[PDB]
Ligand binder design. Structure first.
Ligand SMILES: C=C(C)CCOP(=O)(O)OP(=O)(O)O
Ligand SMILES: C=C(C)CCOP(=O)(O)OP(=O)(O)O
Ligand code: F3S
Ligand code: F3S
Lengths: 309, 310
């Protein structure tokens, strides 16, 4: 059985930074360190940190005075940010700079009373955080997940409209939504294409090259990881059997039974060690040496705030 | 999805009085009406009165001469009260009678020059006002929040020592703190149990009953409401997901997704209209008719001063 590895895969620059922020805060201030929501959507990373002293809460209300609070990589709304600022807490923002960039644009439209449309999945924290950047009652902030939502969307002034997108969306599906937006609101304004980050675009490009060669595709990532799910679905879209797994323990013999080529990749929030163990399980299941596919080079690094180095 | 309502919940006698005090003053003297600190810790109540011309400030130096000033339900230190008195201002005290009660005991201890220990949360206005009732240099006024604080405390004369508590604390945590105080300072004197008021005691008792029946608990109250937070904590500590929300808009679908029983209560400063809207939201989210639980009856009512009747 041939084992192929997608390239790129795993840790993006935003995730690397976020983790380092929690780890450093713990080293600098000792336990406990409070984090609002899983720092990144990976159970191994979250469990690991929890074991080191990180305490993941749901509401800032649960955080004691004098404590250190960290915002997760997915970002937070202005209400959450203001609530933290009014509390006696030391706060560190692990929001990925690429999400913050979308935030600023939403805040802008808001200060211009112009309505904005967000392409994203309802319920996801990044969506709450981003839509949470809109305040102006005179304008409007709307969410659309598909062309249908677009077909039914009703706004106040389609002459002054703009759109933005979640950063971990499917490049292809997002393209369809955009097309619908432009046909329905010919005066709508947005980025040159979308707000999908380099990491997501690259990992999707990479999984596509992987699948056209592997019969089975294993995507290391947690169920609540948007970008990870995207990877698995794209693979399944191309006719390949794809599986979203948190670690080696999830692999089922039946899955790679008689498979001559299995592909492995990882979401932007999954550590490489998890992949390493996946290859090990696959090899103790028949697989041969792991062969990394040639891929797009990534050179972006986001440094931790000076205070936490 | 079954919708359960804690009993009792919402408005306590103190909150109901403080609000009526600001409303009545506005109706008698018209706007503006200055209020030191949020009358009660609820943004809906505050934003509303602010819309009606009540100006909430934090320092007396923010109030104009000849203006009407109202002290919040949480109370004020003697320093603030004196500063107000030294100024050309008309003052109406909305301090909860139950808070004033604790004030009097701290004042008593101060006169005797005997040291007092307050169990409370640093920074809260009630704590600031109560600590502010002690002014005798020869004595002492100390604050402790947990047994850990008690373990570090050293006093001048532990033979003459008394303690008091904030009125909105967790009954259970406060009990543990008391236990520590009596073991470290065996001759300390205090109330029979604590200064936690009936409303705080009943609401905690009520949310406990609610929690052992609902999977998820929604506590209607603002972030800065001490008693509201205790309600959420209690439920959380019983293994239930609990959220502190200001109104229906804060409710996230994932919280109640596939939840067969959700419980809702409200802090002492949250208007029922807010609960009604939360129920409405939960219902359009799959919930049915709201079921009120059986609960201890509350019959306390604090009247507004005669000078403000309408
Ligand atoms: C902060 C961003 C952009 C997401 C990083 O990956 P995660 O797995 O942690 O979270 P999602 O893909 O679900 O956005
Ligand atoms: C004046 C008292 C006793 C508190 C009333 O409730 P609030 O919500 O207004 O304020 P806290 O619980 O934070 O004390
Ligand atoms: S927005 Fe940021 S956190 Fe990771 S995948 Fe894209 S980099
Ligand atoms: S002390 Fe007073 S204002 Fe409310 S919670 Fe208790 S009554």
């Amino acid at each position: 059985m041939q084992i192929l590895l997608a390239n790129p895969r795993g840790f993006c620059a935003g995730v690397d930074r976020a983790i380092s922020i929690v780890e450093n805060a713990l080293a600098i201030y000792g336990a406990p360190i409070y984090v609002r929501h899983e720092v990144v959507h990976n159970r191994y990373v979250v469990d690991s940190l929890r074991e080191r002293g990180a305490i993941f809460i749901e509401q800032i209300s649960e955080v004691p005075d004098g404590a250190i609070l960290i915002f997760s990589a997915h970002g937070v709304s202005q209400a959450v940010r203001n609530e933290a600022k009014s509390r006696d807490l030391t706060v560190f923002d692990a929001t990925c700079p690429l999400v913050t960039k979308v935030h600023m644009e939403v805040a802008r439209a808001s200060r211009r009373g112009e309505e904005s449309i967000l392409i994203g999945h309802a319920g996801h924290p990044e969506v709450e955080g981003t839509m949470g950047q809109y305040s102006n009652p005179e304008g409007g902030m709307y969410l659309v997940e598909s062309p249908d939502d677009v077909w039914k969307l009703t706004v106040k002034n389609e002459e002054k409209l703009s759109f933005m997108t979640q950063t971990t969306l499917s490049v292809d599906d997002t393209s369809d939504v955009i097309d619908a937006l432009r046909k329905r609101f010919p005066k709508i304004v947005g980025p040159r294409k979308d707000d999908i980050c380099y990491a997501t675009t690259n990992r999707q490009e990479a999984v596509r090259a992987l699948a056209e060669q592997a019969e089975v595709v294993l995507v290391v990532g947690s169920k609540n990881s948007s970008n990870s799910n995207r990877l698995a679905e794209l693979a399944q879209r191309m006719g390949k059997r794809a599986f979203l797994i948190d670690d080696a323990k999830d692999i089922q013999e039946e899955w790679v039974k008689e498979v001559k080529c299995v592909g492995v990749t990882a979401g932007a929030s999954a550590p490489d060690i998890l992949v390493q163990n996946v290859v090990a399980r696959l090899q103790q299941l028949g697989g041969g040496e792991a062969i990394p596919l040639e891929g797009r080079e990534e050179n972006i690094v986001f440094e931790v705030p000076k205070e936490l180095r």
